[PDB]
Each structure stands twice: as structure tokens, then as C-alpha cells.
């Protein structure tokens, strides 16, 4: 990419959000996608197969360019997994009682959530992120018969196993 | 906020002045909030960066403890943005050297510092003619095919002399990035000692 | 057409103004009070409208 219009591989990053099935309403990326040798349709519908077999409730979506190859990975977002940690999937055409539904445990699955929080956080080790991603709730409301409310004060686990 | 929360900070500074006898005085004139987040995690094995305000002139009140003396030599340096970085594992320079990361560089008109600045007779690569920042001063240049050269060399500005605005802007156009030393290190304290970054100190 | 730094000079002198809601008198950006005796020195100020 540099004095004159060069490249030298294609290993260039682009990130997208949102996802029903895929797209397709005379639309996908454009702007970044078209000049880049990608398309709007085949590299759209191959974004189905990988962002599929269950994602249908908004996604984050890194697409890596290689010549004209668009790699369709679903990189997990902290609230997206906590929406998919739900008593899950009702999907579309009802839904209707809406997405403020809100009752889901994640007792050690938030441990697995704060585990898969890959790098991002620049972390004090669990016992603080456990509280960061525990505190970001609105749907669920903490562990079987509790509220996030009173986990924040304490967490008698994780701490010295994650370092 | 702030007769209790104040009186709280006081108990955490007085702690690290006792427990931590190795003190690194750091100048963070240019800094980002995402920058420090990364510097503390890049030095998590080692150091403890401590950021306060005016109140840092409360080394007096730990020195008041009918106790410590040589903390008088810490008095002239609590001024003009400063924080300290308390560390157990130090061990001299060798962790201090690996801290120095990318940065100024910078270079501004009205500055003074480090050593004799040179621009090795190398071919620049800027757009053609672009000779006006050389022609304004005086260096022998030539268009060999397309791009520009200096076909000679010398020191542009010497130690103690002021750098003009046109001679500053030409140096940062060339990519030559000297005159700087902010967010790095100002003055060490290790056991009543007075180090000085002019150079043994490391 | 009219270079940015040049423009935002003239803007400084004709556009960023407070204005009295009583007397329509035109005032500097900081004004919390009018100049004029006629309105009764009001405090009812608004910013002058930025051209779309």
C-alpha cells in the first residue's frame, strides 16, 4: 500500500457488527469491501456458513482479507456471549416479549466468559474482571437465586487459579 | 469526596515511602490514559507507578515522624508534573534501560538540549524540488534522478544553541527525531543518594 | 474559496456572539449580561445562530 499503489500479500483487517442471517438487501460492507477485490455476494454468503449454526442475535465479525478471500470469524464480545449465556435461543418472528427478558445463572460460565475475554481487559486477575463483566448486566441478574448487586461486594473462587 | 478520601491518599503515599526504599521520579508531560494502562501491565512483574498532585510535598509529613532525615534532598524535585514508581526487585539500571520506549523525538522551536545533531549525507526521498528548507539555510544539494540528496554534510545546530522554527520543521520532515526526554526518567533516589542523568546514572 | 484559518478569523468577529433576547443587541461569547440600559441589563442571552 505505499508510494505508488502496492500491496504485498493481502493480510489486512476489517471488523463488522450485526447479523440476522447475513445481509443481501443490495448491501454488505461496500466502501471497504469493493475496492479490495472482494465482492458483495459470494464473500457475503460464505459469511453465513461460519457465522452460523447459531449466531442469530447480533454479532461482532472480523473478516481477514487474503487476495480476494474474506475469512469470516465470530470474535466474541462480552455482552454478546452474556446474551448467548441466556436461557437461549428464541430467535425472530417472536422474540416480541422482547430482549429485556432476564434470568440466567452463568455461575462459572461467567468464569468461562472472563476466561475467553482474550487479552482485551489488561487484567487484574479474575477477581476484578469477574466484577467488571458481572457488573455489565441488564438481562440475566447473577447466579441461580441471587442478584449481581451482592457479588460485586465480595467472589471466593478463581483468584489464585487464573494467575 | 474529600476530607476522608484525601486523608486516605495520605496513608498510601506514607506506606510506599517506608516499604519501598527505591524511588524512580518519572516525567509524564505527554501521556494517554490507554498508555498508562499498558505501561503498568508491561511492568506488572516489577514496578508500582504512583500518580498524585501538589500534595506529593507531604514527604515532609512522613519526614515529620520523629524519624527520617535525607528526605530533605527529595524537596527540590516535587515540582512541575512528577510521579514516583516504587519497585522491590530493582537491581540498578537493567530494568530501567528496557523501560525506554518509542517517543520524542518530537522536536520543537525554542528548545536547547542533548548532543550535536547531525544529518548523514543521505538521499532524502521527498517530492522534487523541495529544496527551499535547505536553500533557506545553506547545504549543497542535487537532483540525481527524481529524488533529492545532500552531497556534503555538517552539524546543523550545536549544544547550547537555540533551534529555529525552519530548522526544526525541516528535521521532523526528514524523520530525524532528536531533542526529547520527557516521559522516561528525571531523577532517581536510592538510599539518600543523588543520581544525575548526565551520564554515570544507569 | 476562503481558506479555513482565514474564515474562522472572520467568524470570530461576526458569528460567535451572544445576543440579548430583549434588545437583540450583539454581545461577545462570554456575556452573562447585556450592555444596554434599554433592556435593563438582562441576562436573557442566547447564542447567535450558526449559518447552516
Amino acid at each position: 500500500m505505499p508510494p505508488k499503489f502496492d500491496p504485498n500479500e493481502i493480510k489486512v483487517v476489517y471488523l463488522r457488527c450485526t447479523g440476522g442471517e447475513v445481509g443481501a438487501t443490495s448491501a454488505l460492507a461496500p466502501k471497504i469491501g469493493p475496492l479490495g477485490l472482494s465482492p458483495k455476494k459470494v464473500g457475503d454468503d460464505i459469511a453465513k456458513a461460519t457465522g452460523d449454526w447459531k449466531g442469530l442475535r447480533i454479532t461482532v465479525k472480523l473478516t481477514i482479507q487474503n487476495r480476494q478471500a474474506q475469512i469470516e470469524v465470530v470474535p466474541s464480545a462480552s455482552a454478546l456471549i452474556i446474551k448467548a449465556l441466556k436461557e437461549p435461543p428464541r430467535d425472530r418472528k417472536k422474540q416480541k416479549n422482547i430482549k429485556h427478558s432476564g434470568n440466567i445463572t452463568f455461575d462459572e460460565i461467567v468464569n468461562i466468559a472472563r476466561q475467553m475475554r482474550h487479552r482485551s481487559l489488561a487484567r487484574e486477575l479474575s477477581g476484578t474482571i469477574k466484577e467488571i463483566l458481572g457488573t455489565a448486566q441488564s438481562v440475566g441478574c447473577n447466579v441461580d437465586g441471587r442478584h449481581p448487586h451482592d457479588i460485586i461486594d465480595d467472589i471466593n473462587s478463581g483468584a489464585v487459579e487464573c494467575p | 469526596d474529600r476530607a476522608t478520601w484525601k486523608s486516605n491518599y495520605f496513608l498510601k503515599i506514607i506506606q510506599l515511602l517506608d516499604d519501598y526504599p527505591k524511588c524512580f521520579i518519572v516525567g509524564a508531560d505527554n501521556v494517554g490514559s490507554k498508555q498508562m494502562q499498558q505501561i503498568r501491565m508491561s511492568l506488572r512483574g516489577k514496578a508500582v507507578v504512583l500518580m498524585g498532585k501538589n500534595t506529593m510535598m507531604r514527604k515532609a509529613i512522613r519526614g515529620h515522624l520523629e524519624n527520617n532525615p535525607a528526605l530533605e534532598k527529595l524537596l527540590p524535585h516535587i515540582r512541575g508534573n512528577v510521579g514516583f514508581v516504587f519497585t522491590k526487585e530493582d537491581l540498578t539500571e537493567i530494568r530501567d534501560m528496557l523501560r525506554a520506549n518509542k517517543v520524542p523525538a518530537a522536536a520543537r522551536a525554542g528548545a536547547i538540549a542533548p548532543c550535536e545533531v547531525t544529518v548523514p549525507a543521505q538521499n532524502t526521498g521527498l517530492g522534487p524540488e523541495k529544496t527551499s528548507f535547505f536553500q533557506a539555510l545553506g547545504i549543497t544539494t542535487k537532483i540525481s534522478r527524481g529524488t533529492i540528496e545532500i552531497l556534503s554534510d555538517v552539524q546543523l545546530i550545536k549544544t547550547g544553541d537555540k533551534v529555529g522554527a525552519s530548522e526544526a520543521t525541516l528535521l521532523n520532515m526528514l524523520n530525524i527525531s532528536p531533542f526529547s526526554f520527557g516521559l522516561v526518567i528525571q531523577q532517581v533516589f536510592d538510599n539518600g543518594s543523588i543520581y544525575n542523568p548526565e551520564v554515570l546514572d544507569i | 474559496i476562503i481558506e479555513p484559518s482565514l474564515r474562522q478569523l472572520a467568524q470570530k468577529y461576526n458569528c460567535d456572539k451572544m445576543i440579548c433576547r430583549k434588545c437583540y443587541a450583539r454581545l461577545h461569547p462570554r456575556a452573562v449580561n447585556c450592555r444596554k440600559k434599554k433592556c435593563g441589563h438582562t441576562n436573557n442571552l442566547r447564542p447567535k445562530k450558526k449559518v447552516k
Binding site: - | - | 474559496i1 476562503i2 482565514l6 474564515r7 478569523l9 472572520a10 467568524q11 468577529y13 461576526n14 458569528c15 445562530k49 450558526k50 449559518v51
Partner: protein, 190 residues
């Protein structure tokens, strides 16, 4: 409430020699000599510093609104000192969409002659005050330089041409043309 005393010392430099005739301050440095009368304000101007180091303005049985003025005299005196040492320079850069404002100084300073502002046939003329040397700049395109010793005189004169150049019956949000002050500074900076 009357305040028994208020005062202020101006620190006079080694270059200049102020000498006050009662209340009337005269100032002579390198550049020239200035004068001004504070035969209104009513204060006590002493020159206490020997060799010659301090103007001190008193004020004395003064209520709030005259206490103000202690500092204002104190200012027009600094402002003189800066004028007779350094001298001031207001720069003013002409501004437009379209018709080139076409300036031409015409005795020495004095007549600043302006064709074509907004296609107007009437050639605006503007006098400077005495001691104000206008001149068309170089090292920049549409830009005047008003030099003088006296702030008062130099900035009416900026403002005279800044105000002579005003549009009528338009949007002055849109019609941002005319000549206006870009930089108040000095001749010599030090």
C-alpha cells in the same frame, strides 16, 4: 465601604525614563516620547524608586468604583512603556470569497485605499491617526501592518479600516469579507 488604601507599582525598565509633571506622565525610551494625562482619574502618582525604578499609583479615600481605576492607570502606563520600547504592530488580513480587496497606502501611512471590496465602485478611504505608520506587508499575501507607538491610536486605526469594511443588507454569517485584525503584537519582541 470606602477602602483606606489601594495602590500598585509599575516596574519601569532601565531603557526608559518616565517623568511625571504632577499627574501627567511623559515617557521617553528608544523609540520616541509619549505623553498622557490622568487629569480626571484623580490619584497620587509617585515616582518613589530612586535611580528610576518604580511608578507607584496610590488611590487613597476611595470607594469601589475608583479603586477599579488604580489598575487602569497602571495599565495605560505599562502600555506606554511597551509602546516606546518595543512599539506595537497590529496585523490585519483581508478576507474573501471573490472580489479581491485591493489595498494601497498613499502618503506614508495615512491613506489606506481600498478598491473592489465586494465589487463596490466606491473606493473607501481611511486616514490613520498621527504617529501611525500603515504599510502593506510582504512574506504574506493579503495583509496590512499598522505600526505605531500608541496602542490607542494604532487600534482605532485598525478598527477604522476594519469597520469601514462592513457589508450591508446581507448575511454577515455568509458574507465574511472585509479586512480584520489577525495578530496584535510588537515590532521588536526581545
Amino acid at each position: 465601604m470606602k477602602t483606606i488604601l489601594s495602590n500598585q507599582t509599575v516596574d519601569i525598565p532601565e531603557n526608559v525614563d518616565i517623568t511625571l509633571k504632577g499627574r501627567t506622565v511623559i515617557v521617553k525610551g528608544p523609540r520616541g516620547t509619549l505623553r498622557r494625562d490622568f487629569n480626571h482619574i484623580n490619584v497620587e502618582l509617585s515616582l518613589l524608586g530612586k535611580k528610576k525604578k518604580r511608578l507607584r499609583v496610590d488611590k487613597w479615600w476611595g470607594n469601589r468604583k475608583e479603586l477599579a481605576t488604580v489598575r487602569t492607570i497602571c495599565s495605560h502606563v505599562q502600555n506606554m512603556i511597551k509602546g516606546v520600547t518595543l512599539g506595537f504592530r497590529y496585523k490585519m488580513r483581508s478576507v474573501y470569497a471573490h472580489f479581491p480587496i485591493n489595498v494601497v497606502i498613499q502618503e506614508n501611512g495615512s491613506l489606506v485605499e481600498i478598491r473592489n471590496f465586494l465589487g463596490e465602485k466606491y473606493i473607501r478611504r481611511v486616514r490613520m491617526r498621527p504617529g501611525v505608520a500603515c504599510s502593506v506587508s510582504q512574506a504574506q499575501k493579503d495583509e496590512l501592518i499598522l505600526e505605531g507607538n500608541d496602542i490607542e491610536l494604532v487600534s482605532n486605526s485598525a478598527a477604522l479600516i476594519q469597520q469601514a469594511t462592513t457589508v450591508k443588507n446581507k448575511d454577515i454569517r455568509k458574507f465574511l469579507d472585509g479586512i480584520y485584525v489577525s495578530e496584535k503584537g510588537t515590532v521588536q519582541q526581545a
